[PDB]
Amino acid sequence: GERVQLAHHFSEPEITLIIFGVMAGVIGTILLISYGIRRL
Amino acid sequence: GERVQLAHHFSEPEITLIIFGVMAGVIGTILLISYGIRRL
Amino acid sequence: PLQQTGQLFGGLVRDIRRRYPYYLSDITDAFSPQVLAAVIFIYFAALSPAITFGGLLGEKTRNQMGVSELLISTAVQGILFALLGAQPLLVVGFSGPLLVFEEAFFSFCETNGLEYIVGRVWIGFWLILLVVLVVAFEGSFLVRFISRYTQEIFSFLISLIFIYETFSKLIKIFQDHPLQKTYNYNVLMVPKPQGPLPNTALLSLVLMAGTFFFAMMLRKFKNSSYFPGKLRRVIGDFGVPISILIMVLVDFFIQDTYTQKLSVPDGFKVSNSSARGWVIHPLGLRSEFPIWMMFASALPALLVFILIFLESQITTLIVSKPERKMVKGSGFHLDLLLVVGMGGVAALFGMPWLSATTVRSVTHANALTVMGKAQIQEVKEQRISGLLVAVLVGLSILMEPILSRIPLAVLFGIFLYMGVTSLSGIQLFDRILLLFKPPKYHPDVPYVKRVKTWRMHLFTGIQIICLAVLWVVKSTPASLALPFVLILTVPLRRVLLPLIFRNVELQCLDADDAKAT
Amino acid sequence: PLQQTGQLFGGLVRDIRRRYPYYLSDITDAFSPQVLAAVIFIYFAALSPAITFGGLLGEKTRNQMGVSELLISTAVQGILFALLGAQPLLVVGFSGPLLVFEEAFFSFCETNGLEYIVGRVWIGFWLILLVVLVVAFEGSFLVRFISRYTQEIFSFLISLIFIYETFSKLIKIFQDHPLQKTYNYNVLMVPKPQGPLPNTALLSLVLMAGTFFFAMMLRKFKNSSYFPGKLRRVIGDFGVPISILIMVLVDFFIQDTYTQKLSVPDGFKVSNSSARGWVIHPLGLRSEFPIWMMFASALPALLVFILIFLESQITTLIVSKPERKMVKGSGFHLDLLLVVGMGGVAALFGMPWLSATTVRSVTHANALTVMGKAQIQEVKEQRISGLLVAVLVGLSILMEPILSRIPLAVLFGIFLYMGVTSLSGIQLFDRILLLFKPPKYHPDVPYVKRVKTWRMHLFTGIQIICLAVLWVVKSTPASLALPFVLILTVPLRRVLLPLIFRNVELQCLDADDAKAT
Numbered sequence A, B: 001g002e003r004v005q006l007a008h009h010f011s012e013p014e015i016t017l018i019i020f021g022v023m024a025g026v027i028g029t030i031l032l033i034s035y036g037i038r039r040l
Numbered sequence C, D: 001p002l003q004q005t006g007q008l009f010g011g012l013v014r015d016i017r018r019r020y021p022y023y024l025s026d027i028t029d030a031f032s033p034q035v036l037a038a039v040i041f042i043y044f045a046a047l048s049p050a051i052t053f054g055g056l057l058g059e060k061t062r063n064q065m066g067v068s069e070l071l072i073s074t075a076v077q078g079i080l081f082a083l084l085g086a087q088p089l090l091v092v093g094f095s096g097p098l099l100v101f102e103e104a105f106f107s108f109c110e111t112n113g114l115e116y117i118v119g120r121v122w123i124g125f126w127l128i129l130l131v132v133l134v135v136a137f138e139g140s141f142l143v144r145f146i147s148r149y150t151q152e153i154f155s156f157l158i159s160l161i162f163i164y165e166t167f168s169k170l171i172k173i174f175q176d177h178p179l180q181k182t183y184n185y186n187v188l189m190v191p192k193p194q195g196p197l198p199n200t201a202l203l204s205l206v207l208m209a210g211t212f213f214f215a216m217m218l219r220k221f222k223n224s225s226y227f228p229g230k231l232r233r234v235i236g237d238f239g240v241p242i243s244i245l246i247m248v249l250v251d252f253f254i255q256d257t258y259t260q261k262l263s264v265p266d267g268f269k270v271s272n273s274s275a276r277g278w279v280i281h282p283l284g285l286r287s288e289f290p291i292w293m294m295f296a297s298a299l300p301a302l303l304v305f306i307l308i309f310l311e312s313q314i315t316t317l318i319v320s321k322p323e324r325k326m327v328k329g330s331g332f333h334l335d336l337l338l339v340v341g342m343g344g345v346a347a348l349f350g351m352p353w354l355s356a357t358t359v360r361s362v363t364h365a366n367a368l369t370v371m372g373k374a375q376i377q378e379v380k381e382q383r384i385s386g387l388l389v390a391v392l393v394g395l396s397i398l399m400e401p402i403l404s405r406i407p408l409a410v411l412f413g414i415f416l417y418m419g420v421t422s423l424s425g426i427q428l429f430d431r432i433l434l435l436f437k438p439p440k441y442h443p444d445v446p447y448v449k450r451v452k453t454w455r456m457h458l459f460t461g462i463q464i465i466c467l468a469v470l471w472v473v474k475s476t477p478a479s480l481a482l483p484f485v486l487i488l489t490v491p492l493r494r495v496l497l498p499l500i501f502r503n504v505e506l507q508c509l510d511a512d513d514a515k516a517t
């Protein structure tokens, strides 16, 4: 980045991949729930 | 008039009356000549 | 009215019997707000050129004739012309060719050591003799040989000159106060600023543009479909006074910035008290007047008579066209007689002679014109408007605090509005616009549907060459020969044009009442 | 296109199949000079607000987000939207409500000691989640409940705001350099003049008025009957570039006077190198980011989504009206998805999110509109124009010598022209004009010949109260509640209006395609 930045366990690509994976999991769970409803 | 003006024998009303009389005489002579022509 | 009766003073008597029965209507027809709006318009439109020409005359003649004499002469001649003239819609005032003649005559008197004002007195004396002979022999009947060709060429040239002078005054204002990074904040203001000042030229341009924009927008609002019709027409009639008031207030609320204002003399006194008085002796003021110059004054008097005759008669032709709905008649012999006689009389008092100016009279006629539901309906023909304009011009000295707060830039926008609005009724201007249009967009007019497009464009281009020639003559020291070159168009119309155009083509292109042959 | 299919991502797929077959036409339809003229128009019309908003954002956020980041985000989002969007005529850029939200969020982060840019990163992360759910469930179908009522109210309010800001910038210029009798000729110019300067405000006003006048005159010349038709239409299409070039040259030839110019950053670098880099760590830059703010960012993300959704969808409704001859279709689901996704991605890079602005997109559509022999004939729907505009916005840094000589006053006149031309297609503006007209002058339209005059005037006045309420909300610190008050007009149209107006009256006054019920 710029100047001095606090060091984290996860780098920027790693943390953004984790966040995108969590978002994809949430979206998939919501889609599966919506698919389950309107059928039974 | 204004300031110092050269003195004349005829004052302004007198000279303008003389000039108008001469003009009227000339106009009358021209009119009489025009009346004489176009008839004989 | 242009017919030759053959009787001595026959034209003069016919003009009197034509209009004087309508004298009672000439007072009652002014009971309308449009007449008051026209009075307010023509008051400025005649006062500002009068002030400018008086200042120039005082500068170029060592104040022998100046602003005060010109204003008093304008007031007296306008009052007498409104009370006794046959076409009261004409505005009597000073003009540019008259100023050029005054410059030339002052130079001639200075070279030969002659008294300029006494020479003017003798010229005016010779002016009275010439006009009476013309009226007695009905010499004004020669005006019937001036067709729409010469009238429209002269009107277009005069409007172009007016617009050019209006823009050149703004250019001179910009030159006097140029746009610079730094300015001297300590500059003497009395009598005029001796150095460039900030924000002056730009504010003058802003005021002129705003005045022109407001005038044009209110003129459009007159023909617009907004507001109730009565209130809409009332606002449209007062469009120029409203624009003038708005821009004057805008300049008034800007205290810090300097803008040039109207300047009038302190009182009713001669411009140079050390040069001459109110009455100038025809025999001489300081030195005895030579005998030979008394008879030699006829030729300058002849030139003055030619200039005034052409200007006044062509202006009367323009304002009294049948297509303008003039249903009261005009007198060519009576108006010319009155104008030249008043000029000769005012010459005796050391006051400039005047002429019926084209722009002011056309603007006065247009301001009194009532538009129907596009189509001209009627004209508010009355004597009250010109009389009130002359009275206000005479009283302009007494209302100095009101005039001292009016910028010239607002008047410049008013002049530009007058110039652009004076081109509406000219077919030459319309055919010039047709040079930049496809043939299918030409309006349904007799000179388009009966004449080939290239023939009409050639006919228009012939007039353009005449306009260029007249413009060249103006920009030369021999600018007093302009009436002769203008007269030379009549042989072009009556002799040279039929050699290249057919009779039907000339009847369609040059029609006295816009008829299809 | 607004129907609900019931299938997951059903709207997204339908929008893709609607427009992507026309992709080949979307490149070949740009082979015309009108497209190039529209590119030149929209380049300035998007660059100048981008520069102004970037400067304001840098001032109000301590340069954490500034001109360079906003320009780069605008370029990237415009390129991706032109290449992949379903309505390429929309212009993607920053807007005022977004700036207000940025101010509020910066204040909130400063109060609680939170990192503003990381909070923006988390908001953009929450932005991606919200939009995908809306697209999956076809949440964009709710746009069909926004009738012509709300669309025209929003468009009229936004045009009024644009004109008001354009005039207020000139007022601020006048306040910075007031008209004074004396000025300090030694004033430091770097970075900005620290004191009043002569001839600055007046020249800015002159340049703005001249730009507006030239733009309006060339727009009239497009519809005029002068010149050959092909050359006339070519000149009319390039009217805005011609006016900009003329006024820029006029200012260029005035060396001494100072006028504010366009300012761009020196290079493609972050605005504050000591604050953040190109990639901002979601876990924190200086301090560890709190866990609670990661979940609490949804509500500001909800507000941003509401703002962007309303702006983009109402703009799409305005530009895709059936009366505008849009014969290629628009995708509400795809465009919203792309805009919000690009905003969320640009949040990660420390760049501002954007929205489809009403004024810029309407001007872009009008610049590509071909007028028949009055009547709209077709629209030059193509992707090349927006792509070129985004490319030129991105390259604006590299063309600093060209942009450094362009005054803001010319851009102010361009903004005024855009504001006055954005009111043509609004029936609310037309019915406001009918308040100042007699009933017999009303045009032959279904809402006049089938509705009483006083009923129509009451219906117009109801919208005027809504406009006043929306204007009041803007002038309050709670200006972010404007979308909710705008939405509240829909219950007024669907519930309260039928209680006082008949079904036929509402169908005539509020018609989706201007039909007589």
Ligand SMILES: CCCCCCCC(=O)OC[C@H](COP(=O)(O)O[C@@H]1[C@H](O)[C@H](O)[C@@H](OP(=O)(O)O)[C@H](OP(=O)(O)O)[C@H]1O)OC(=O)CCCCCCC
Binding pocket: C227, C228, C229, C230, D435, D436, D437, D438, D439, D440
């Ligand atoms: C401030 C004015 C008063 C405000 C109070 C508001 C109350 C108010 O002003 O209504 C009275 C009056 C309605 O009366 P009305 O419509 O019949 O008046 C007609 C109108 O004057 C037309 O201009 C006339 O046609 P034209 O021009 O000669 O061709 C027409 O005459 P005609 O030829 O058909 O025989 C007139 O009948 O107003 C209006 O004029 C409508 C425009 C109002 C616009 C709103 C006013 C700004």
Ligand SMILES: CCCCCCCC(=O)OC[C@H](COP(=O)(O)O[C@@H]1[C@H](O)[C@H](O)[C@@H](OP(=O)(O)O)[C@H](OP(=O)(O)O)[C@H]1O)OC(=O)CCCCCCC
Binding pocket: C435, C436, C437, C438, C439, C440, D227, D228, D229, D230
């Ligand atoms: C500088 C240009 C060249 C100068 C050289 C001067 C030589 C010169 O330019 O003449 C050629 C051409 C004449 O050809 P022409 O009059 O037939 O051309 C018509 C003209 O283009 C109309 O605009 C068209 O209608 P629209 O607009 O589509 O509705 C019309 O098409 P249509 O619809 O009827 O089928 C065209 O036929 O010029 C002009 O256009 C007249 C205006 C010239 C004005 C003077 C040019 C400034």
Ligand SMILES: CC(C)CCC[C@@H](C)[C@H]1CC[C@H]2[C@@H]3CC=C4C[C@@H](O)CC[C@]4(C)[C@H]3CC[C@]12C
Binding pocket: B018, B019, B022, B023, C125, C126, C129, C291, C294, C295
């Ligand atoms: C055209 C009008 C003015 C009339 C024509 C002018 C000629 C014919 C007349 C009119 C007035 C006349 C002058 C009137 C008075 C005098 C004073 C006298 O001691 C010498 C002759 C002299 C100076 C006259 C010379 C001739 C004169 C100038």
Ligand SMILES: CC(C)CCC[C@@H](C)[C@H]1CC[C@H]2[C@@H]3CC=C4C[C@@H](O)CC[C@]4(C)[C@H]3CC[C@]12C
Binding pocket: C435, C436, C439, C453, C454, C457
């Ligand atoms: C000179 C500038 C200002 C204007 C140029 C326009 C003029 C010269 C052009 C425009 C339209 C042209 C006309 C168009 C059509 C024809 C028909 C053809 O069978 C003979 C020539 C003629 C009659 C042309 C003559 C020249 C013309 C009148």
Ligand SMILES: CC(C)CCC[C@@H](C)[C@H]1CC[C@H]2[C@@H]3CC=C4C[C@@H](O)CC[C@]4(C)[C@H]3CC[C@]12C
Binding pocket: A018, A019, A022, A023, D125, D126, D129, D291, D294, D295
């Ligand atoms: C709406 C999108 C962004 C997903 C919803 C956000 C929630 C559910 C998720 C997404 C990313 C997650 C973070 C990812 C990584 C870490 C580092 C770990 O040492 C502590 C938990 C923490 C800080 C997580 C907290 C919960 C978190 C913020």
Ligand SMILES: CC(C)CCC[C@@H](C)[C@H]1CC[C@H]2[C@@H]3CC=C4C[C@@H](O)CC[C@]4(C)[C@H]3CC[C@]12C
Binding pocket: D435, D436, D439, D453, D454, D457
């Ligand atoms: C409020 C300002 C801005 C505009 C004023 C104009 C409005 C209020 C005026 C102008 C014309 C008027 C109408 C003219 C004629 C009639 C017919 C009459 O039988 C009932 C009233 C009605 C229908 C009027 C209602 C009020 C009206 C619509």
Ligand SMILES: *[C@@H]1O[C@H](CO)[C@@H](O)[C@H](O)[C@H]1NC(C)=O
Binding pocket: C062, C063, C272, C274, C275
């Ligand atoms: C008045 O005229 C005299 C010459 O007679 C001249 O010296 C003087 O300058 C003039 N006055 C003005 C104000 O020009």
Ligand SMILES: *[C@@H]1O[C@H](CO)[C@@H](O)[C@H](O)[C@H]1NC(C)=O
Binding pocket: D062, D063, D272, D274, D275
């Ligand atoms: C950049 O941010 C720091 C705080 O991190 C601030 O002190 C500095 O003024 C900013 N730079 C500019 C140019 O504003």
